[PDB]
Amino acid sequence: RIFDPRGQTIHQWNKIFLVACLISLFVDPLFFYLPIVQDEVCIDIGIAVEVFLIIIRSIADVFYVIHIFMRFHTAYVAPSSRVFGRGELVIDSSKIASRYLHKGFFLDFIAALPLPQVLIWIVIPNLGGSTIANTKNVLRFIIIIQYLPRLFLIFPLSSQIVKATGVVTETAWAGAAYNLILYMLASHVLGACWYLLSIERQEACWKSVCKLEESSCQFDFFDCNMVKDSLRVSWFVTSNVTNLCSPNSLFYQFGIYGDAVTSKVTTSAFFNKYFFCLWWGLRNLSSLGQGLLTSTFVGEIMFAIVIATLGLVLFALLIGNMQTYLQSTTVRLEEWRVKRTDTEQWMHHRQLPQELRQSVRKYDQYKWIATRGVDEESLLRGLPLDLRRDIKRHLCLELVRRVPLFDAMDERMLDAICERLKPALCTENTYLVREGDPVNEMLFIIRGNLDSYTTDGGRTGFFNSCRIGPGDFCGEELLTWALDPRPTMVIPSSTRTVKAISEVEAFALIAEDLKFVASQ
Amino acid sequence: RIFDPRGQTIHQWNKIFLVACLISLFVDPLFFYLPIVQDEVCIDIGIAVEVFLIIIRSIADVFYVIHIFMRFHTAYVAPSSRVFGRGELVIDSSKIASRYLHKGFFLDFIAALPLPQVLIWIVIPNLGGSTIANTKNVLRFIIIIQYLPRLFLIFPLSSQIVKATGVVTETAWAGAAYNLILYMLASHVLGACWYLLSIERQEACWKSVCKLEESSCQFDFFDCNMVKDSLRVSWFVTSNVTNLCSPNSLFYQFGIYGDAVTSKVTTSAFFNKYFFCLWWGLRNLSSLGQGLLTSTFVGEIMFAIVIATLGLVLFALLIGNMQTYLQSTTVRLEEWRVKRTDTEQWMHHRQLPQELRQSVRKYDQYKWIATRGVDEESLLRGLPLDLRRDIKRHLCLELVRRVPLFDAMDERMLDAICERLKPALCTENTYLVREGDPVNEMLFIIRGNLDSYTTDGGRTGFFNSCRIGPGDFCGEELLTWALDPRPTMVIPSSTRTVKAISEVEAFALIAEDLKFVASQ
Amino acid sequence: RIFDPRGQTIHQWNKIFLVACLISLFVDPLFFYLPIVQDEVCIDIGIAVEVFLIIIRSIADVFYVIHIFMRFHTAYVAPSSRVFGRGELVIDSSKIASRYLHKGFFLDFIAALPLPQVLIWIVIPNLGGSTIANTKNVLRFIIIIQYLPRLFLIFPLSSQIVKATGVVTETAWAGAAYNLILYMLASHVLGACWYLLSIERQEACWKSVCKLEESSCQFDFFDCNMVKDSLRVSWFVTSNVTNLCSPNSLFYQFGIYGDAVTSKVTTSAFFNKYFFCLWWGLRNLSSLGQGLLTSTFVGEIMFAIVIATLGLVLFALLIGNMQTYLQSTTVRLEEWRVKRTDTEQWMHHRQLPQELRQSVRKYDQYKWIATRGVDEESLLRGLPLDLRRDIKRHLCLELVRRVPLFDAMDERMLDAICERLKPALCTENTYLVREGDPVNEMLFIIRGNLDSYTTDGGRTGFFNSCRIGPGDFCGEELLTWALDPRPTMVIPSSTRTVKAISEVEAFALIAEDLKFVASQ
C-alpha cells in the first residue's frame, strides 16, 4: 500500500492538498470577523457565519489528517550513493515511520489538529464562565499560532509542485501570479488582523468609559447577551458612551482603527465588512504603510511596522518578478538590439561608405526577420543523434534528391551530407558567386528565386540566365570535385554568376565536407 | 482580389486599423461622461456631446466592419509541411471563410457591431417609457461588456504590427512608450468609470433622501425632464436634498466618490470634468490606490481593489521596461566595467609593479575608446562572404597596394589576404617589435605614427629612424619569408626596433597565415 | 585659430560650458520666485532678488554667447571615408560656418539670446503702462519657452563629456548621481512653476472677488504701486478679501494651491519660500503625484498630469540606475553563486559520497578566494605581445631561472615557456600525483608549502620527504623527457609522491608545450 514518491497518485494528492491548504489559509483568518458590534453598544458573534466557518475548517483539517495518513505511508529515497540504479526506496513501515517522526511530523501535526474547531464549539460552554461572546475576542490566539506553521509549510509544498511539473508556465505567468496570490493572501490576513484589533481597541474604549462611570457600570455590561437587562438599558440611556468612544472625540486615541469606527465597519453585514477589511489590507500593504497615523501604543505601532515591512518585501518582490518576466519575454530582442548597435557603431568608427553601409544593416534585418536570433548549430548539436539526423533528413530530402549523384546512392553518405549541412542567408541583389571566384560553399536553395548567367566567359551573346527558384541546384563544380577520384586541391574557377535577385534563403555546405564524404 | 497576408497593403491597413482601434479605446469610455448634474438637482444628458460621440463611434464601427470585410477576404499560410517553398497561401474563399468562422470571427465581431450607437439613439426613444435621461444612466453595461474584447484584441494586433516592421525602435523608446500609452489608457478608463459610479452613488443618495421624504417625492421625480413642474419647485423649496447629499453631511456614505461632489465635478463642462476624471484615474493608479478611503459597500470596494491591482501591475511593468531600457542603452559599457575591475583586482592579487599597471590600464582604456567593445572578428564572421570581402577590401585596398609583392599581381590573393586580416592596437610608448624579436605579425598602419630604427645591430652611429606613419608597411622579414619558395619553418628575426611613438591602430596578420597564402 | 574638436582646449571648454549650463538650469527658474504677495493684499517684486538673478543670468548668457563664438570657430571632421588617416578636419572657415548654420546654430542661439535680460529691464519700463509689478506675472512665458532648448541641448553636451573621458566612475556612482542631479533639477523647475501658478491662482481669486465688488473695486487695486492710495485703503477696510480668498472658504477653488496660502509661502522671505517650493516639487515627484487634489480647471489638471508623468519616469530611471549599479558592483559574485548552486545540484543528482563532495566544495571556495572569478587566460590573451610577455617575465623570472637547463641559457626559450604558463590550484591536503603516474604538468610553486616523498618505489624506510615551499621546483621527469634529443612519445612516470600539505598556488605547464619549445 506504500506509494512511490514519484507516482502519479502522490502527484495528484499533493496538488489537491495544495489546493486544500490554500483554502485553509483563506478561511482561517475569516474567524476574526466573527465578532459583530450592534447599535446597542454590544459585542455579539454571528452564529450562522461561525457554523459555516467551523464546517469549512473541519473539512480543511480532515484533509490535513488525510495528508498525515498518506505521508505516514509513503517511501523516501534513501541516500545510498551506489553506482547504478535509483531504486533506493524503503518499503519497510518502521524505517519510513522513524524517518518521518524524526523530521516532518511535529510541524505537520501542530498545524493539523482542529484545536480552533473545538475551543469555540465544545470548550466555550465548558469554559469557566457563562458568557460566550466576551471570551472569544482577545483569546483568538490559537488561529494566529496555528497559522504560522501552515504558512511556513505552504512554501516547500509549492516548491515540490512546481519542481515535479516541468516548466511552471510559458514565459512568466506562473512566476507573476504566484506573488500576486501570496500578496492577496497577505492582504486578507492583515485585514482580518486589523478588524480584530479594531474590535479589541473599541472594547478597550468601552472598558475605559465604564471605568469613568464605575458608579453605575460594570465590565460585563458590554456583553451583548445582557443587553436586555433593565440596568443595562438604564445605564445606556443615562451614559454617553455612544459618543465618547468615537474618533471625533479626543477621549481615547483610536489610532488607525478610527477609520474602522468612523466607517461603521464593525456594525455592517459580513460581506461588506470582509471586503472593507480586505481592501484596507491591500491599500495599506500597497502604499508601503503610509496613512497609518498610529497612536502612542506599542501593539498598534508594531502592527503598523509589520505591515510596512511586509509591504516593502512584497512590492519589491513583485517588481523583481515582473522584471524577470520582461527579461524572459524579450531576451532575444535585447541581444538583437545589442548586435545592431555594435554593427552601427563599428561601421561609424571605420567610416564606411553610405552605399555599402545600407547593406550590412539590411542583411542584419533579414537575419533577424527570417531567423529571430536562434543560433542554428548551437541548438542543433543539442539534439541527440536520432533526432538531429531525422530532422536534417526531413528538412532536406528532396533538396538532396535533385543532385544527380546523390539521387542514385545509398542513404549512408546521404545522411552524412544532411547532418553536416548548414544554413545560408543572403539579402537582395547579392552577387552570391561571381564568375571566376572560388566555389567552396555548396548551397541548396530552400526559399527564393535566383538568377545565374554565363556570358561565354566574358563575351556578350549566348546567355545561360536561368530563373532558378526554390528547390534547385547550384555549384556543380563542387560536385565535379566530389566525383573526382584523385585527391586534388586545385580550386575550380566559377563558370556562372550566381546572384540573389529576390527574397532568398539557402543551405550552404563546406567543400571539405564533400571531400570527407567522398573519401568514405 | 484576395490579399496576401505578408503584402504591403495588409500591413498598412493594419497600421491604420490599429490607429482606429486606439481611437475606439479612447472614445468609448467618453460615453460615461454624458450624464450632467444641474444646479437644480437633476440628471441631464449633454445632447451635443452625445451626438458627437455617436458620430465618432459610428465611424469607428464602420472601420471595424471594413476590417471584418478585409479579413474575410484574406489569405493564410496553410500548415503544409512540404520540403521546399513557402507558397501555402490558399485562394479559395470557402476555406478561409470556414477557418475564420472557426476562430477569429466571433471575437472580432462581438466588438464590432454598433450596439452603443443603437441602444442610445434608436432604442431609448422607443423604450418602454418616456424618461430618456433616466434610462441612460445605470444601463451603460454595453460599453463595459464590449470594451473588454477590444482591449483584449489590441494586444495580438499590436504584437503583429511590431513583428511585421522589424525592430520597434532604436534602443528602447517603443518599449518604454507602449507601457505609458497603456497606462494613460487605463487612467482614462478608470476616470470614466469613476465618473459614472459617482453619478450612480449620488443618484442612490437622492433615492435615499426621497425614501426619507416619500410623502412628497417620487423615484422618477428626479428625472431632469420634469424640472419645470410646479411640484418640482415646491418640493425643492421644501426639501433639503441640496445639503443632505454631500460629503459634509453624514446622511449617506459617499466614500471615494465624495471628492466628486465636494469639487462639483458632476456639474462643470465636458472638458473640465473629463480632465478631472482622467487626472483622478492617473493619480489613484500611480499611487497604487492610496487615498481611496472607501465606504462599506461591496461594489465600491471591488472597484478600489481593481484600481489597486491594475496600478501595481502597470507600475511594475513600467519599472521593468525602464530597467530594460537602461540595460539596452549601456550594455556594452557593462562588460567593459567588468573587465576593468577584473584586471584591476587581478593586477592587485598578483602584486604587479605600479609602473606596469599604468600601461595595462591605459591600453584597456585606449581599446575602449577606439572600439567600444565590438568583437571585430565575431561580428565580421556573421556577415556573408560577399559582404565580408567587400568590407575588407574597402577597409584595406591602398594599404595592401603599397607592398612590392601584392601590388602588381592578381586580385585573387589580394582578396584572400584582405578577407583574413585582423585588427591590432597598441598603447602610448609601446616597444612593439624590438630588434631580434620574431616577426610573427606584419602590420598596416591606418591611424597613428610609428618609430622604428636600426642601430647597425646595436652599434651607435648610422640610424634608420624613419617617420613611418599612416598608410605604410612594416615587418618586411615575414614578406621575405613568404617569398622564399622552399617551405621552411624558420621565423626571421626583426632587424629594426619597431616602437609606437603615439597611439596607433593597425591591421595584423599571423605568419602562418601568410605562409598558407604563399603555399597556394 | 581654429581649434581641433578633440583637443584639450575644446575638452576643458566643454567641461566649463557644462558647468555654466547647469548653473543656468538652476538659476533661470528662480525668476518665478520674484513676485511676492504682501500682507495688504498686493503683488510686489523684490528689487534686490531680481537684480541678483538678472546679474547671474547675464553671466550665464555671456558664457552662452562665448560658446556660440567657440563653436563658430571650431573644426569639424569631414565625412570622408578615404582609406588611411584621420586628418579630415576642415580648416576652412566658410565651410565650417555653413555647416554650423545648416544645423546647430538655430537651436543653440534660441537658447542664448538674453530675452529675460531685456524684457524685464528695458521693455517693462518702456511698456505701454506704468504698472511694473502687474506686468511680470502673466507674461512669464519667455522663461518657459527658452528653457526647453536649453534642457534639450544639455543632453548632447553631457553625452559628449561622458564619452570624452573614458569610464565615468568606478562602477556606477556617476550613473546614479546623474539621475539624482536631474531629479533635483526637475524638482526645482516644478517648485518654481508651482509658486508661479499659486500666485496666478491667488490673483485670479482676487479678480473674482473684485468682480463680486465691482461697485467699489476695479481690477487695478491688486498692483501694489497703489497700496498707499486712499481708495485702496478704503476698499481694503470695507472689503473682506483677507479671509475670502482662502482655501478654508468655499468662494473659489484653490485646488492644490491651498497649501500655498495655508502655509503662507507666498509672503515669506526668499529662502523660506524657495525651500518650501523646492520641497513641494521634490515630494510630488517622489510621491508620484498623490496629494494633488486638483480643482475643475484645465491648466491645474494638466500641470498635475505633467508632474505625475515626470515622477513616474524619473522614479523608473532611478530604479533602473540603482539596479544597474548593483549588477555592476556584484556581477562577478553572480556567476560564482550560479556555479556553486549548479555544482551542488550536479553532486546531488549523481549522488556523490559525503567525503568527496566536501573536497570539491572546498576547492570551489579556494578558487573563489584566490581568483574571485577573472578568467586568467581569457584576460591575459587580450593584451598585445609587448605587454603579455612583460607580464609573464615579471610574474615568473627566477621561477624559470631556478631550473639549471634554462637558467644558464638564452632568453628565447625562457620567453617561449613564460608565454605558455597557466596557473594551477590545489586545495588543503591535496595528494597531487602518485608515485608512477604520468607527468603531464610542469608546475612551479609560487605560494604555499608542499610535501613530496619517495618510499623506495613502495618500500618503507629511506624517505625523500622535503619541505618544498615558495619558489621551489617540481616535475623533474617532464624536464628529463624534454631533455631527450629523440622525439619520443612516452610520458615519464613520477618518482615522487608530490602532495600539497597547505594552501598552494601553482603554475602548470603543458607537456606538449614544453616539447614544442624544446623542438625549436
Author numbering:
A (entry chain A), B (entry chain B), C (entry chain C): 58 to 577
Please share excerpts from the published article on this structure:
Cyclic nucleotide-gated ion channels (CNGCs) in plants mediate Ca2+ influx in response to environmental changes. Among numerous plant CNGCs, Medicago truncatula CNGC15a/b/c (MtCNGC15) is localized to the nuclear envelope. The MtCNGC15 was reported to be activated after the sensing of Nod factors and negatively regulated by camodulin (CaM) to fullfil a cycle of Ca2+ release and retrieve between the endoplasmic reticulum/nuclear envelop lumen and the nucleoplasm. Here, we report the structures of MtCNGC15b in the absence or presence of CaM.
MtCaM has been reported to negatively regulate the activity of MtCNGC15b, but how MtCaM binding affects the CPD of MtCNGC15b remains to be elucidated. However, the MtCaM was not stably co-purified with MtCNGC15b. We then fused the MtCaM to the C-terminus of MtCNGC15b through a short linker. The fused complex exhibited good solution behavior and dispersed evenly on cryo-EM samples. Although the cryo-EM densities of MtCaM itself were invisible, we can observe the density of the MtCNGC15b CPD. Consistent with the previous findings on the inhibitory effect on channel activity, MtCNGC15b exhibits closed inner gate. Instead of accommodating cGMP, the side chain of Arg553 in MtCNGC15b occupies the hypothetical pocket. MtCaM binding significantly stabilizes the cytosolic domain of MtCNGC15b, as evidenced by a lower RMSD and confirmed by the structural observation. Upon MtCaM binding, the local environment around Glu533 changes compared to its state without MtCaM. Based on the structural observation and electrophysiological analysis, MtCaM may close the channel through stabilizing the CPD of MtCNGC15b and modulating the local conformation of residues near the arginine.
